[PDB]
């Protein structure tokens, strides 16, 4: 059943990288208005 | 009597071959099924690794375009 | 009756030799099947290793390009 | 005579099963060994992937730390 | 001696019967390594036909992006 | 009495062999036919590659033409 | 009286059953090697098609680079 | 032997696409100096 397991990792790795990209995009959005003030 | 002895010997020999052939029935099937499975899994893990790369690159870009579009609209508003 | 009792035995042993040889052959094939599966699976494992490794490079390169295109874009935006 | 001849033939056949049997056993061992190495290969592929995911998140965070830092530097100078 | 003969023959049927049985089992497997393989082959062929379609789209998209980045680059260069 | 059972069982194995040698032939037809199918599938792939290399290059030249008409036409008018 | 012929019927049967066993084996040789070859060649096509995409994209980007590095240097000279 | 016949066509297709890209890259180079004159 390992075969599945690594496949689960592929399908939940994808999710974590997408999540990190979205938070990256949110961090910059929250970073902009502070950058203009400084 | 020698003949008889040969007959006792050939019978045992021919029953130690049913057994041998059945072991090799059983081993083949088992082994091939495992082989199959492993192989298929490797190609899933390599047909999805590539989809994953494609979707990761698209979103990444897309997102940047979104940042250069809604961020740009912020300045006009 | 013993002669018939030897002829049947020589048919049976002939029919045993036939079965054993069809089994030997069988066995040689199984041992050659194995080599092939040690080289298709080896090839696929090498292929997936090269793919993961180069997928890592692709993602890192796109990340760096993304950074360099974003930094200049902010710089350029401030000037106009 | 025939008897003796038959015996000889039979002797050859008798050998030809022990080897076959012996070899079946060898085959079985090797199959199993390969099964075990394939089990370790999937586990080596698994660590790799997770290592890579960690690497990618570290690089995301450095990237985000970095450009932002540069901007800050510009604003302080 | 016939009793002997009959038993040679009843026993004869006993090894042969199993011969057929085994054979039957292998045929069952065979029809199992053919249906399965057909489906496996279909899957792999699907993969190549969809990667083909995917590769074509990737090359076309990169060509269009190349054309849009070159056109603007020349126009921007003329202005500065 | 035993001979009647034996002859029925033998008839009862001839049918099985006949069945088995009938079905084996059916399996052999399934195989040859499959060889024809796999070959046909590879042929389409080849054409699809030469279609895809045709679609790709005309576009290439095509693209270039578009570029000339986006720059050259502006100069004329 | 049938017994002698029963011995014969059986003989015919085992002349054919072994033959079935031979043919069956031959069909598994012929359609085993063929499937490994077909699977291996499709896997290699799919792998090299993927590699071909990577090399094609790399050169494209480098074409851009070289049409902007050396073209840019043309204006300064 | 059709397998070798598809692999060779893949390689030839790679070569032809690279050749078309280079030719493209040469056509624009020969196009520039004419563009500046017009
Ligand atoms: C442990 C290591 C990991 C640590 C990590 C730490 C490393 C440090 C980082 C330094 C890197 C920096 C280096 C500079 C980076 C620049 C590179 C770069 O960046 O080049 C870009 C191209 C891809 O180009 P690309 O990624 O831009 O292409 C997209 C995608 O198409 C998307 O979907 C598009 O969409 C999108 O554009 P969009 O429209 O805006 O969305 C476009 O980006 O990569 C390549 O060069 C691929 C190379 C092939 C190599 C060739 C051969 C190798 C093949 C060999 C195999 C032979 C095998 C058979 C063997 C058979 C089996 C035995």
Author numbering:
A (entry chain G), H (entry chain H): 198 to 235
B (entry chain A), D (entry chain C), F (entry chain F), G (entry chain D): 159 to 235
C (entry chain B), E (entry chain E): 156 to 235
What does the paper say about this structure?
In the homo-octamer, the TM domain consists of a dimer of tetramers, whereas the CC domain forms a dimer of trimers; for two of the eight subunits of the TMED9 octamer, the density of the CC domain was absent. Specifically, we noted that each TM tetramer has internal twofold symmetry, and twofold symmetry is also evident between the TM tetramers. PIP (36:2) fits well with the cryo-EM density at both the headgroup and the acyl chains. The importance of the observed molecular interactions is supported by delayed elution from the gel filtration column for CC domain mutation E190R, the PIP-interacting residue mutation R223E and CC interface mutations Q177A, R191E, and W205A, all of which compromised TMED9 oligomerization.
TMED9 is a member of the TMED family of cargo receptors that facilitate the bidirectional transport of membrane proteins at the endoplasmic reticulum (ER)–Golgi interface via anterograde COPII and retrograde COPI vesicles. Sorting signals for COPI (dilysine motif, KK) and COPII (diphenylalanine motif, FF) coatomer proteins are contained in the cytosolic tail of TMED9.
